[PDB]
Amino acid sequence: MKIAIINMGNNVINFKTVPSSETIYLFKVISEMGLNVDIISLKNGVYTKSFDEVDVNDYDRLIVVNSSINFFGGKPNLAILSAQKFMAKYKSKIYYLFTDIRLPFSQSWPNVKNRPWAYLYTEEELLIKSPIKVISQGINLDIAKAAHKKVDNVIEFEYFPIEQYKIHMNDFQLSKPTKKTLDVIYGGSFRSGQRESKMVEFLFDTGLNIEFFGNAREKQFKNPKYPWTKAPVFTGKIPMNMVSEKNSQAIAALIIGDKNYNDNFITLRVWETMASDAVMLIDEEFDTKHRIINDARFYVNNRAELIDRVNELKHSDVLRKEMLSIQHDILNKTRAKKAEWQDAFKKAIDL
Ligand SMILES: O=c1ccn([C@@H]2O[C@H](COP(=O)(O)OP(=O)(O)O)[C@@H](O)[C@H]2O)c(=O)[nH]1
Ligand SMILES: [Mg+2]
Numbered sequence: 139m140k141i142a143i144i145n146m147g148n149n150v151i152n153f154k155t156v157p158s159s160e161t162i163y164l165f166k167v168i169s170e171m172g173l174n175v176d177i178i179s180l181k182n183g184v185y186t187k188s189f190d191e192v193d194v195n196d197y198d199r200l201i202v203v204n205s206s207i208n209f210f211g212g213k214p215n216l217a218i219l220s221a222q223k224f225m226a227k228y229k230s231k232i233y234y235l236f237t238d239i240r241l242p243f244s245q246s247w248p249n250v251k252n253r254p255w256a257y258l259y260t261e262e263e264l265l266i267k268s269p270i271k272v273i274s275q276g277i278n279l280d281i282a283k284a285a286h287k288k289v290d291n292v293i294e295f296e297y298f299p300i301e302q303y304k305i306h307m308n309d310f311q312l313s314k315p316t317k318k319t320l321d322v323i324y325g326g327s328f329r330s331g332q333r334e335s336k337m338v339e340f341l342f343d344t345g346l347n348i349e350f351f352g353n354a355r356e357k358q359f360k361n362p363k364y365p366w367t368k369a370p371v372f373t374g375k376i377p378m379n380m381v382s383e384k385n386s387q388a389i390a391a392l393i394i395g396d397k398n399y400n401d402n403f404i405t406l407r408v409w410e411t412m413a414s415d416a417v418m419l420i421d422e423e424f425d426t427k428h429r430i431i432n433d434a435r436f437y438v439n440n441r442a443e444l445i446d447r448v449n450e451l452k453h454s455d456v457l458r459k460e461m462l463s464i465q466h467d468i469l470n471k472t473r474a475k476k477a478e479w480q481d482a483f484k485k486a487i488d489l
């Protein structure tokens with residue numbers, strides 16, 4: 139029994155990049171389940187074996203982490219091409235880990251054929267024909283299916299909370315009390331504006347000391363539908379393995395998501411935030427039933443309520459520590475279900 143896990147569109151080496159980090163973390167959580175797993179990437183490394191040195195059909199299961207397959211500048215991207223070539227030769231079912239609604243499985247050949255460098259690859263080499271099982275982070279399978287409406291071989295769909303992987307690591311640990319330097323914090327990309335309204339509502343013109351880290355930059359917020367006067371401070375990107383420590387610098391950390399994420403996705407940030415020393419404040423619309431934490435104090439409906447809640451935490455250290463204790467307790471209640479989680483994952487990949 140040998141399992142192979144690959145990232146469909148990014149090179150995997152270490153924790154210097156987010157997609158590489160995510161693949162390594164998934165590799166780790168699967169391995170810790172008592173399974174033999176290899177990460178296959180462009181070259182052999184501390185965490186990987188090269189695509190060329192192995193033979194895909196020697197593996198009993200092929201797991202693929204979702205990614206975009208867009209070629210920038212219309213130039214070749216070996217991570218994408220080699221991953222799909224690897225997938226194309228596999229003769230069994232492919233398990234696609236669908237954690238980002240915007241990254242559904244897609245065929246690269248259709249884009250390659252019209253390229254001047256098309257002569258470098260053949261349809262036979264890149265067209266993936268094996269049946270595929272999409273393992274959806276989102277519970278709503280129709281949304282997942284709508285996202286894959288163009289593919290002809292994506293046959294199955296099954297929900298599984300993939301991004302709980304950070305809390306189930308053998309080396310997982312809650313963040314410790316941290317000196318506060320910010321009132322509110324949020325880390326992420328601009329996600330092509332798929333969440334601009336919420337970002338402006340909760341992070342702009344608040345009068346609070348707010349920091350926005352990650353790939354997002356102030357100049358990206360220019361939609362006339364969502365005006366603002368004073369923006370939060372944009373500090374740049376940090377390694378994925380440092381996100382909880384970063385969140386911990388603030389009194390509170392914001393939870394928001396894409397339209398299709400509301401009452402559907404429980405993203406990685408939910409856990410990175412819950413496990414941090416920052417009080418988790420959730421956009422009401424993101425979890426209307428309060429399923430993450432059955433305590434309305436952790437939820438905010440708009441800018442005004444966010445401002446009120448944050449001030450409350452600033453004027454009462456005891457309230458802040460109470461809420462942190464509660465989210466830490468809730469996080470642990472989910473960790474106590476690791477066995478179930480592991481068995482659910484194994485079943486998801488037909489083991
Ligand atoms: O500087 C940063 C900012 C974000 N992240 C990671 O990127 C995720 C955010 O991804 P995205 O912006 O797509 O938001 P999501 O849709 O995950 O909420 C975080 O949870 C982190 O794991 C990171 O590693 N470094
Ligand atoms: Mg994610």
Ligand SMILES: [Mg+2]
Pocket residue numbers: 434437438439443
């Ligand atoms: Mg309220």
